[PDB]
UniProtKB/TrEMBL annotation, chain A:
Name of the protein described by the UniProt record: Type II pantothenate kinase
Lineage of source species: Bacteria, Bacillati, Bacillota, Bacilli, Bacillales
Function in brief: Catalyzes the phosphorylation of pantothenate (Pan), the first step in CoA biosynthesis.
Gene Ontology annotations for the cellular component aspect, listed alphabetically: cytosol
UniProt entry tagged with the keyword Ion transport: no
Alphabetically ordered keywords of this record: ATP-binding, Coenzyme A biosynthesis, Cytoplasm, Kinase, Nucleotide-binding, Transferase
Assembly and binders: Homodimer.
Length: 265, 259
């Protein structure tokens, strides 16, 4: 078989292609050892690698392998996944929301990195843990769905009281801006985790909508594993993308865009 | 008098005299204003109305964006800068980003990462409510065990962007579980992430509007050298030219008076 692997900061994504039956496999990066041992016992017609931990794999394998830059690979797998799923977009921003976040403009032909920020899945896990002691990703993201952000976040209408503001009053003005206004109140693990995802969702969208306006597209494709088991994040991202007059897109297996692309380059 | 009554701080300029007062003590500002009559009064900010209705004299009310820009242009001239164009980034309770073309300003975006987040998230990670103690507590914090750089993700590989870049704020926490995340380290990371998001937003609209100049203002920079260093280093790293300005947090109040 043919196998493509995007070995990221947190997750290793593997796709095997047989003929036209894909297999999508996720493993932890910390169990990268167990991906190598597994790889060495497969019969592999072609192997392709990308991501930060690609070299760790290449060196520990007894089989040659091509290595591609993850920006190029993500773009290539995303284009394939968008066609398959019936989106024919002339151009778009894509925002890869992984351990960290990378923002790309795809003009129709190629991708170009137009920015990035360290607000993404790693912040959700890291800051999440600092605010809740919860290490289990499932527990963390499940708990955050039940959360309320009202006592934590400060909207524009709170700063502008009775009077009429110069931007929409419902907008978030200050993430964690209301904490000092509602001391006494507990601040529950749910509420705080919702606010973390809230701030991460909002920064990514802001960057994406800004860059979208810069390169003159209304299409914003969001990918990365950060969106798995995290409805709040997609909602946050999606509502605000629409609110700013852009069109958000999520993609089935969009978090495997790198591993697929590695196979088709 | 010119006043910019923000979400957190009320900034007063008497014509120059520069006085700051907490927004939660707005009651005392009215009390103070009424007790001494004034030739002309101008107002701006979110809490301009709360003042206007609790006061005697017909003080004009301006949009804070237009005022901030008018005051900043004046502060820049007084402090020897002659910039043809620039972005300015008003880092207040939240953050508002503006492109000034040489003639007028335009709001080009904003984000809720700023001083309100430094205070709020800061409290949630340290229990510290005093602004001066918190920002001091952060100054010599160490981010190594909290933040994840590009070179950490790209251990065996050559990275496609500079390895010293921050990759994931707080993204090292799970890699340093049996360790004490001290209040200083954690407060340094809060300021770290706030400073980086504001810079990224700033440099992006700077590229968009074809200007290399980025003027940073707001009171988020008072008593926070780390925030300035963070904003400044990375602005320079992205080929843009950062500027701070004396009393730049009073830009709105000054601008209210000139308009
Ligand atoms: N099973 C899981 N374990 C840990 N994190 C997960 C899991 N599923 C989703 N995530 C989220 O996805 C993020 C990393 O996703 P990914 O897009 O694969 O980045 P990378 O390419 O760096 O591995 C994590 O930081 C976390 O927020
Ligand atoms: N003495 C202080 N007390 C509280 N916060 C302060 C103080 N000095 C500086 N700050 C910081 O500056 C922010 C206020 O910036 P500013 O431009 O005055 O915002 P606003 O216009 O919303 O009042 C606060 O959220 C806080 O981060
Ligand atoms: C001092 O550093 C200032 C940093 C300013 C913020 C800029 N940071 C960045 O653009 C890097 C953000 N992260 C990313 O682009 C990604 O995480 C990558 C480093 C490409 C790794 O990809 P993944 O492992 O898939 O997250
Ligand atoms: C629900 O919306 C989700 C996220 C929207 C984020 C965009 N938010 C913004 O552009 C507003 C951010 N805040 C600001 O621009 C400022 O804080 C202002 C509201 C202008 C007030 O100024 P000050 O009181 O001086 O901070
Ligand atoms: Mg990745
Ligand atoms: Mg202000």
């Amino acid at each position: 078989m043919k196998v493509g692997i995007d070995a990221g900061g947190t997750l290793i994504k593997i796709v095997q292609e047989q003929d036209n039956q894909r297999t999508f496999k996720t493993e932890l990066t910390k169990n990268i050892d167990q991906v190598v041992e597994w790889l060495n016992q497969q019969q592999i017609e072609k192997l392709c690698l990308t991501g930060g931990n690609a070299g760790v794999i290449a060196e520990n394998i007894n089989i040659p392998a091509q290595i591609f830059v993850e920006f190029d690979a993500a773009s290539q797998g995303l284009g394939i996944l968008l066609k398959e799923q019936g989106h024919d977009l002339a151009d778009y921003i894509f925002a890869n929301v992984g351990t960290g976040t990378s923002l790309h403009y795809f003009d129709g032909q190629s991708q170009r990195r137009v920015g990035g920020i360290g607000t993404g899945g790693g912040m959700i896990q890291g800051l999440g843990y600092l605010l809740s002691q919860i290490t289990d990703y499932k527990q963390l993201t499940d708990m955050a769905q039940h959360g309320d952000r009202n006592t934590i976040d400060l909207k524009v209408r709170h700063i502008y009281k009775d009077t009429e503001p110069p931007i929409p009053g419902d907008l978030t003005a200050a993430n964690f801006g209301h904490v000092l206004h509602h001391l006494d109140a507990d601040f529950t693990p749910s509420n705080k985790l919702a606010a973390v995802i809230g701030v991460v969702g909002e920064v990514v969208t802001t960057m994406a909508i800004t860059v979208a306006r810069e390169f003159k597209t209304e299409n914003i494709v969001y990918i990365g594993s950060s969106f798995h088991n995290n409805a709040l994040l997609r909602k946050v991202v999606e509502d605000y993308t629409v609110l700013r007059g852009c069109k958000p897109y999520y993609v089935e297996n969009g978090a495997f865009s790198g591993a697929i692309g590695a196979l088709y380059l």
